[PDB]
Amino acid sequence: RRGALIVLEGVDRAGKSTQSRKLVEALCAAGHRAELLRFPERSTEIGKLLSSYLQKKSDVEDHSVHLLFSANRWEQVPLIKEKLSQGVTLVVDRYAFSGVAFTGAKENFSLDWCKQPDVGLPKPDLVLFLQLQLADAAKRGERYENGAFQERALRCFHQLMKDTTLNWKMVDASKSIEAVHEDIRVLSEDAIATATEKPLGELWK
């Protein structure tokens, strides 16, 4: 039986990294083979250019930066497919959705253009959206770290959620770390148990 591809999305400070780490821990403690992945994955050459960019150490033309973020996902596709075929469930901290939402929050970027590079990536079996008021997210904890930009990103995320081809689940990320974790864990157990019967799909196609 293949593993499940579970993605956590949300604006900055929504609790994605905290919940992805806790989810992998709990699934492993309950006997599942599960591993954490994140995007961008900064250990690669592409990821290094992305990190310099996000730290404002370098400036990059907006379309180039968008394409590098997508290429950074494609470079991990062979690994993603191999792990899933091996029975390993992958918990992914940000994915193509963040890619479209953050670039789509910029001027003169259509959602259609932003989606294309990621068309065909492994399709998540479950996309958890950690919902919380922007003002709350701002009380917790770089480029894109301002309220007006987060608000436009959030709107883009809501457009992507109209996409019925995907198993979106809303999570109330305003609760305690432990309460949000239990909600996420129960949804993830269900997806691992029931969403893996069908072959891995292809995103946005």
Ligand X SMILES: Cc1cn([C@H]2C[C@H](O)[C@@H](COP(=O)(O)OP(=O)(O)O)O2)c(=O)[nH]c1=O
Instruction: Compute the least distance from the CB of residue 149 to ligand ADP, in Å.
Output: 14
Using CB under 6 A as the binding rule, the residues of this chain from 153 to 172 that contact ligand ADP are none
Pick the binder of ligand ADP from 10, 40, 99, 104 (CB under 6 A). Answer: 10
Nearer to its own copies, 34 or 68 (CB): 68
Which residue, 35, 13, 164, is CA-closest to 92?
35
Instruction: Compute the least distance from the CB of residue 118 to ligand X, in Å.
Output: 8
- Does 40 contact ligand X by CB under 6 A? yes
Which listed range, 9-17, 41-49, 112-120, 150-158, lies at the site for ligand ADP (CB under 6 A)?
9-17
- Pairing outcome for strands 122-123 and 5-9: unpaired
CB-CB contact of 40 with 50 (8 Å):
yes
Instruction: Compute the least distance from the CB of residue 4 to ligand X, in Å.
Output: 20
Using CB under 6 A as the binding rule, the residues of this chain from 177 to 196 that contact ligand ADP are 177, 180
Q: Which amino acid is at 16?
A: K
Site string for ligand X, 137-156 (x = CB under 6 A): -----x-x------------
Instruction: Compute the least distance from the CB of residue 18 to ligand ADP, in Å.
Output: 3
CB-CB contact of 99 with 70 (8 Å):
yes
CB-CB contact of 203 with 134 (8 Å):
no
Using CB under 8 A as the binding rule, the residues of this chain from 108 to 127 that contact its own copies are 113, 116-117, 119-120
Binding site for its own copies (CB under 8 A): 45-46, 49, 60-61, 63-64, 67-68, 70-72, 74-75, 77-78, 113, 116-117, 119-120
Binding site for ligand X (CB under 6 A): 12, 39-40, 54, 69, 94, 98-99, 102, 142, 144
